[PDB]
Amino acid sequence: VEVTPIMTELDTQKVAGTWHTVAMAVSDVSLLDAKSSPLKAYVEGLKPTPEGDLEILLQKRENDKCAQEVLLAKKTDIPAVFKINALDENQLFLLDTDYDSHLLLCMENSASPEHSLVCQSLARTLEVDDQIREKFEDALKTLSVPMRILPAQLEEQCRV
Amino acid sequence: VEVTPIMTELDTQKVAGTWHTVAMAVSDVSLLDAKSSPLKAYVEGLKPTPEGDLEILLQKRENDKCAQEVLLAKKTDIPAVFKINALDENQLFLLDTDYDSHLLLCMENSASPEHSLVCQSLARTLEVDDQIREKFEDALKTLSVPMRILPAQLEEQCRV
Ligand code: NA
Ligand code: NA
């Protein structure tokens, strides 16, 4: 157990730019609203702002259509923990893993952290495979709520 | 603004071992209980456990005597955010700054984050100077609550 989550001051350009959701994971007992599931929103880009907030560019599975959604996750009083009001969730964080080569984007609802927690594995290309899915599972085990990764699906509408 | 707080999986040995509090900082409007001020507790060591918690070994200014205090800050459902019930505070986090060469230890009380937030600058030796105090101020500015560093004091009872 040679690795643990800490907060670190990170070079903005390790976070900024284009990203692709290559895998998703949910808490063992997951109770998501359905009308706006975090599982239907695919990250396309990130951008830390000059004020310390985080912009997230998403594409969501919206009815059988694909819409663009821009979230401004706001700084809170604990560093690296952001406030949103979207996708059934109200808390968001980035988890930089496997020596800064694997970014996780995770969302939670403080009313029921154990039922609402979803994480997405982000990458600079849409390329997946077992090993990357295995690297995602390794990072998820350092999390408090037990988590399960969703089955790989090669094509997903609205996922760039 | 090329640097922002993210959560990262960090090598446990960057955190474990002996540390010394070389500077302290408080929120501009600080309202601390007085009977157990976070300003009278000096960190001596840290140890991430196999379960994901964090042990903190402190020495506190206890009446005009010096006592040893061991805190077991517990994992919560947001990574890198720990739960305590001590020193007037209930939330604790580590902030690794200035390219992992400067550890900050910060505590807060969720009832009033803006009044209770205190950070300590930790180092491998007790050596301070302006530049290190300046590096501490740089990291504190990425925090949401505005903060002020306390005047340097060369000798402080109970501070190893
Ligand atoms: Na601006
Ligand atoms: Na053990």
Nearest by CB to B4, from A1, A15, A143: name it: A15
User: From CA A160, how far away is CA A125, in angstroms rounded?
Assistant: 9
User: From CA B30, how far away is CA B35, in angstroms rounded?
Assistant: 15
Q: What values do phi and psi take at B53, rounded to 5? A: -95, 180
User: From CA A116, how far away is CA B134, in angstroms rounded?
Assistant: 40
**Closest CA in chain B for residue A111:** B77
Residue located via tokens 């446990």: B12
> With contact defined as beta carbons under 8 Å apart, do A45 and A57 qualify?
yes
> With contact defined as beta carbons under 8 Å apart, do A51 and B114 qualify?
no
Q: What is the resolution of this structure in A?
A: 2.4
Q: Measured between alpha carbons, how far is residue B93 from residues A72, B16, B53, B58, B120 in Å?
A: 24, 14, 11, 15, 11
Check residue A63 and report its DSSP letter: B
Residue located via tokens 């700054």: B97
Contact A143 B79 (CB under 8 A): yes
- Sequence-ordered list of residues with C-beta below 8 angstroms from that of B145, at least 6 positions apart, any chain: A77, B27, B28, B113, B114, B117
Residues of A with CB under 8 A from a CB of B: 1-15, 48, 50, 52, 75-81, 91, 93-100, 108, 113-114, 117, 139, 142-145
Residues of B with CB under 8 A from a CB of A: 1-15, 48, 50, 52, 75-81, 91, 93-100, 108, 113-114, 117, 139, 142-145
Radius of gyration of chain B (CA): 15
Enter the tokens of residue A25: 């994971």
Contact B6 A10 (CB under 8 A): yes
Residues of B in Cβ contact (< 8 Å) with A112 = none
Contact B77 A145 (CB under 8 A): yes
Residue located via tokens 């999986």: B9
First vs last C-alpha separation in chain A: 34
Report the separation in Å between the CA atom of B72 and the middle of ligand 2, taken as the mean of its atom positions.
Answer: 13
Contact A142 B9 (CB under 8 A): yes
- Which is it for the CA torsion A157, A100, A11, A4, positive or negative? positive
**Closest CA in chain B for residue A27:** B77
DSSP 3-state helix, strand, coil percentages of chain A (rounded to 5)? Answer: 15, 50, 40
User: Reduced to 3 states, what is the DSSP secondary structure of residue A114?
Assistant: helix
How many helices (H) and strands (E) would you count in chain A? 2, 11
Q: Measured between alpha carbons, how far is residue B12 from residues A1, A98, B9, B17, B37 in Å?
A: 8, 13, 9, 10, 28
Compute the nearest-CA separation of A63 from chain B (Å). Answer: 31
Report the separation in Å between the CA atom of B52 and the middle of ligand 2, taken as the mean of its atom positions.
Answer: 10
Print the SS3 string covering chain B. CCEEEEEEEEEHHHCCEECEEEEEEEECCCCCCCCCCHHHEEEEEEEECCCCCEEEEEEEEEECEEEEEEEEEEECCCCCCEEEEECCEEEEEEEEECCCCEEEEEEECCCCHHHHCEEEEEECCCCCCHHHHHHHHHHHCCCCCCEEECCCCCCCCCCC
Domains and CATH numbers, chain A: 1-160 (2.40.128.20)
Enter the tokens of residue A13: 């350009």
Q: Measured between alpha carbons, how far is residue B30 from residues B34, B82, B118, B146 in Å?
A: 11, 21, 9, 11
Residue B128 C-alpha from the chain's centroid? 16
User: From CA B105, how far away is CA B73, in angstroms rounded?
Assistant: 12
CB count, 10 Å around CB of B41? 27
User: From CA A130, how far away is CA B25, in angstroms rounded?
Assistant: 46
User: Reduced to 3 states, what is the DSSP secondary structure of residue A49?
Assistant: coil
Q: Measured between alpha carbons, how far is residue A160 from residues A5, A15, A48, B16, B80 in Å?
A: 29, 18, 21, 41, 30
Enter the tokens of residue A89: 């969730």
- Which is it for the CA torsion B141, A10, A38, A63, positive or negative? positive
**Residue A75's beta-bridge partner residues?**
A82
Report the separation in Å between the CA atom of A15 and the middle of ligand 2, taken as the mean of its atom positions.
Answer: 34
